[PDB]
Each structure stands twice: as structure tokens, then as C-alpha cells.
Write a structure and sequence with these properties.
There is one protein chain. This protein is of the alpha+beta class. A 5-stranded antiparallel beta sheet has the order 3-4-5-7-6, with no helix packed on it. It has a 3-stranded antiparallel beta sheet with strand order 8-10-11. Strands 1-2 form a two-stranded antiparallel sheet. It contains 12 helices and 12 strands. The two termini are 27 Å apart. The radius of gyration is 21 Å and the shape is globular. It has 2 domains: 115 residues, Phosphorylase Kinase, domain 1; 222 residues, Transferase(Phosphotransferase), domain 1. Belongs to the protein kinase superfamily. CMGC Ser/Thr protein kinase family. MAP kinase subfamily. It is found in: Cytoplasm, Cytoskeleton, Spindle; Nucleus; Cytoplasm, Cytoskeleton, Microtubule organizing center, Centrosome; Cytoplasm.
Length: 340
């Protein structure tokens, strides 16, 4: 097997000349030369089998990415794993090489309005497709927005995705208030909130709603949006949450133009509509694409949707890790030599 920085990366003979890129979640990521397609690709090593939660996320990501086909969503090109379930300990997922991500970019670069608009278009175009499949991504953040050298953007990491019907993360700053308040009845609107947080961060190079825990983040949200109105408070279906919010001192709205006065006024108008406290008043993906800020891109004939809504055969939340291993073995089989 080929070796990378201490660890087995057993992807030859098809994939060679490995180069460590970094860490994903359950393994390292390398770039490799694909000797069949004659191009460099990305390969992520996943080792999920000893943990039920890692297996659920791996199965979710594989099933969704194999079903989706869209320019602004990362694909799965190939999957390498052992020929028998007993020998399978690691799974290697092969994808288009994307040289950076919005998280890395924002670390060093102040983006022009032109690039902010172009990125925001691509994010919404991919998200239109995800939502049309009846899927919620639930974990949109800059590090999940991959970029190549010519500003093409692809959404990745569907480990936490769910089919819509009204979990540890390192990064909490893109989560909707209704999620942090434990409200009953989440929708696609949680993804629009995340995109709004991303747009704000493209405008300023720092998270707009940081905080050490959900209560600190809620304080940052209310410090900008202002205290919720009575009707928006009532949208929170959690009495303990409503009481907590009522316990806080009153805060006036800080207009977005005061925070980001360099920003395009149309960008701020759309930001305002994505970052509404009440999810029922939050702009939807199709309406966002149709917003004046995006007018130079907006093209419904060139913004495709899924052929039919996505459907999980089984609820995964309940399944033992051994059953999940069987499903991952089945799901990955199409890439095997001699598959039929």
C-alpha cells in the first residue's frame, strides 16, 4: 500500500503520486493522480466502523452524493474499499480536486463585491437543487463550500443532511436561532439562515454571530436583529425558550448598513431577508436567486432541479453500527471490479 505521513493510504495501482492535503473528519485527505482519467483528484480516507454516528454520516453522504448531479455540488467519482465486508475497515472516497474552500479563502483574502455576488449565486444555485430534492443540508458553512482555482464553487459534506419533514459539530456559528432555541418544526429555512451568515462573513471576514455557546451566539444575534417582536417570539415552540428570551434586556435592531456600510445596498437587502429571526418570514432559495443583487446571474432555465425528491429507504438514527456497515458495503458496491 502507499503510505502518507504515518498512515496507510491504500489506493494504488489506479491512484498514485499521493500528496497530503489535510484532515477532513474520519481521515486524511490527499490529492492523487488518477492513471485512468489522467487527472489529479482528491481522495478522502474514512474509518467510521467503530462508531455508530460516524457510520450514519458516512452512509448519508454516500447515498446523497451518488444520487445528486449538479455543477455546484461535489460528486463522487469512485469509491475504494475491500472486496468483502469482513475486510472493509476503511473507505476511500474519490472526488474532483477542489484546491481550496471559502473558509481558507476568507482567512487571507478580502473579497470584492464581484466575487461575493458570484459566490453567493453559486451557493444558492446548488441549494436550489438540494431543496428541490426535499433535502436539508443542515451544516452549511464556509469550510463546506469548496472552490477551485477559477472561482467555481461546490457544496460538500452531506453527513448531517436530512429529508425534510415539519448532533456534534465543531462549528456552530451558522446555525438558525430556531435550532439553538430547540423549537419544534424545522424547515429548509434553516439552510437560508446559514447562507445569510455566510454572506455576512463574506462582507466582513469574521463570523457575524460568534459565541462560546448557544446563549452567547443568541446574544450576538439579538444584538444585531434587535429583540424579537411578539409574533416572532411566538414562533418558538418551546416554552422554556420563550421564557428565556423574555428574560433578556431589550435590544434595538442595528441596521445592516450601519454594520457593513461599504456593502452593496442590494446585498444588504438580500442579507436582511435571509437573516430574519422568524423562519416563516425568511426568504426561500428561489426568491433569493430572483433578488436584484443576483440579477446578472439569475437564469431559471440554467438552474436545474432534482428529477424527484430524495427518499431514504430506512431511518438511520436507530440502526446499530453493524447494520450501517452492511448498508455502506451495499451502497459502495457499484465501484467494485466485476460489479453487476
Amino acid at each position: 500500500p502507499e503510505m502518507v505521513r504515518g498512515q496507510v493510504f491504500d489506493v494504488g495501482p489506479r491512484y498514485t503520486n499521493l500528496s497530503y492535503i489535510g484532515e477532513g473528519a474520519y481521515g486524511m485527505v490527499c490529492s492523487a493522480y488518477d492513471n485512468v482519467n489522467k487527472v489529479r483528484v482528491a481522495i478522502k480516507k474514512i474509518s467510521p466502523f467503530e462508531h455508530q454516528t460516524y457510520c450514519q454520516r458516512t452512509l448519508r453522504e454516500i447515498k446523497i452524493l451518488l444520487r445528486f448531479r449538479h455543477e455546484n455540488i461535489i460528486g463522487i467519482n469512485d469509491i475504494i474499499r475491500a472486496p468483502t465486508i469482513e475486510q472493509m475497515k476503511d473507505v476511500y472516497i474519490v472526488q474532483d480536486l477542489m484546491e481550496t474552500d471559502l473558509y481558507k479563502l476568507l482567512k487571507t483574502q478580502h473579497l470584492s463585491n464581484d466575487h461575493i455576488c458570484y459566490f453567493l449565486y453559486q451557493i444558492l444555485r446548488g441549494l436550489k437543487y438540494i431543496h428541490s430534492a426535499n433535502v436539508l443540508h443542515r451544516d452549511l458553512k464556509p469550510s463546506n463550500l469548496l472552490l477551485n482555482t477559477t472561482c467555481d464553487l461546490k457544496i460538500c459534506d452531506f453527513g448531517l443532511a436530512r429529508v425534510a419533514d415539519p448532533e456534534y459539530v465543531a462549528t456552530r456559528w451558522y446555525r438558525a436561532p430556531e435550532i439553538m432555541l430547540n423549537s419544534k418544526g424545522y424547515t429548509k429555512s434553516i439552510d437560508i439562515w446559514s447562507v445569510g451568515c455566510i454572506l455576512a462573513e463574506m462582507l466582513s471576514n469574521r463570523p457575524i454571530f460568534p459565541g462560546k455557546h448557544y446563549l452567547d451566539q443568541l446574544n450576538h444575534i439579538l444584538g444585531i436583529l434587535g429583540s424579537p417582536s411578539q409574533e416572532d417570539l411566538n414562533c418558538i415552540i418551546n416554552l422554556k425558550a420563550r421564557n428565556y428570551l423574555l428574560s433578556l434586556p431589550h435590544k434595538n435592531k442595528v441596521p445592516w448598513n450601519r454594520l457593513f456600510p461599504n456593502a452593496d445596498s442590494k446585498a444588504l437587502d438580500l442579507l436582511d431577508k435571509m437573516l430574519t429571526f422568524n423562519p416563516h418570514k425568511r426568504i426561500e432559495v428561489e426568491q433569493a436567486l430572483a433578488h436584484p443583487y443576483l440579477e446578472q446571474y439569475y437564469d431559471p432555465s440554467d438552474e436545474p432541479i432534482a428529477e424527484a425528491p430524495f427518499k431514504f429507504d430506512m431511518e438511520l438514527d436507530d440502526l446499530p453500527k453493524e447494520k450501517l456497515k452492511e448498508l455502506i458495503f451495499e451502497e459502495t458496491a457499484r465501484f467494485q471490479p466485476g460489479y453487476r
